[PDB]
């Protein structure tokens, strides 16, 4: 019932200007905030605190301070993060990179 009001309200912030946003969008955000368990805030204090890898959260306000607490608590990073790869100069698990492409010799012969 909370997500309810959050969405309900935020909607009246974008719909106040008359504009239109397709639910899904707003809903996603309203969700991302709620899911976790309560009312996770979209700020350095809240959201950027979850178990996301350190390399990630590192790129948004806490920066150094974060990496410190990484070597300290000896964290581990998935590199499942958009950001991760970006920093690593690697193709990220995003749309185009959400799968692997391969040569199946089998077909590669029945074609000739």
């Amino acid at each position: 019932a909370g997500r309810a009001a959050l969405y309900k309200e935020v909607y009246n912030v974008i719909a106040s200007d008359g504009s239109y946003v397709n639910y899904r969008h707003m809903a996603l955000l309203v969700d991302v905030m709620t899911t976790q368990g309560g009312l996770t805030s979209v700020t350095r204090h809240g959201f950027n605190r979850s178990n996301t890898g350190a390399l990630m959260r590192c790129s948004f306000e806490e920066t150094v301070e974060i990496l410190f607490e990484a070597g300290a608590s000896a964290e581990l990073d998935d590199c499942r993060g958009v950001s991760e790869n970006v920093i690593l100069g690697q193709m990220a698990p995003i749309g185009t990179g959400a799968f692997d492409v391969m040569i199946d010799e089998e077909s590669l012969v029945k074609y000739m």
Binding site: A1, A4, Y23, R24, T35, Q36, G37, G38
Partner: protein, 107 residues
């Protein structure tokens, strides 16, 4: 279960976990005057047997973590007498697809 009028001894309550298995719930009176669940906003929930649950995982290659959480104190949580690990099924109407399915695990 229990319906206290204006409170309980801070010394008393510290003996609810005294007789396990069986557990004890403390509830306020004025806090039951109205049923929250009946509220326009709050959608219905449902408990899940270890089966109904383990099936939700096996069928979503999910880990307990990755599962959307609901407080242990969450208003509704107590209503249906929730317990740290139990899973709930939230089912509400959707302006995009009539009815949406969703699960909440307890904190």
């Amino acid at each position: 279960i229990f319906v206290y009028q204006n409170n309980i001894t801070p010394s008393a309550m510290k003996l609810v976990p005294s007789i396990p298995p069986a557990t004890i719930e403390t509830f306020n009176e004025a806090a039951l005057v109205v049923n929250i669940t009946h509220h326009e906003l709050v959608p219905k929930h449902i408990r899940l047997s270890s089966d109904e649950k383990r099936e939700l995982l096996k069928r979503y290659r999910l880990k307990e973590s990755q599962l959307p959480r609901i407080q242990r104190a969450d208003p509704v949580a107590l209503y249906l007498g929730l317990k740290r690990g139990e899973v709930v099924k939230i089912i509400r109407k959707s302006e995009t697809s009539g009815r949406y399915a969703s699960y909440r695990i307890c904190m």
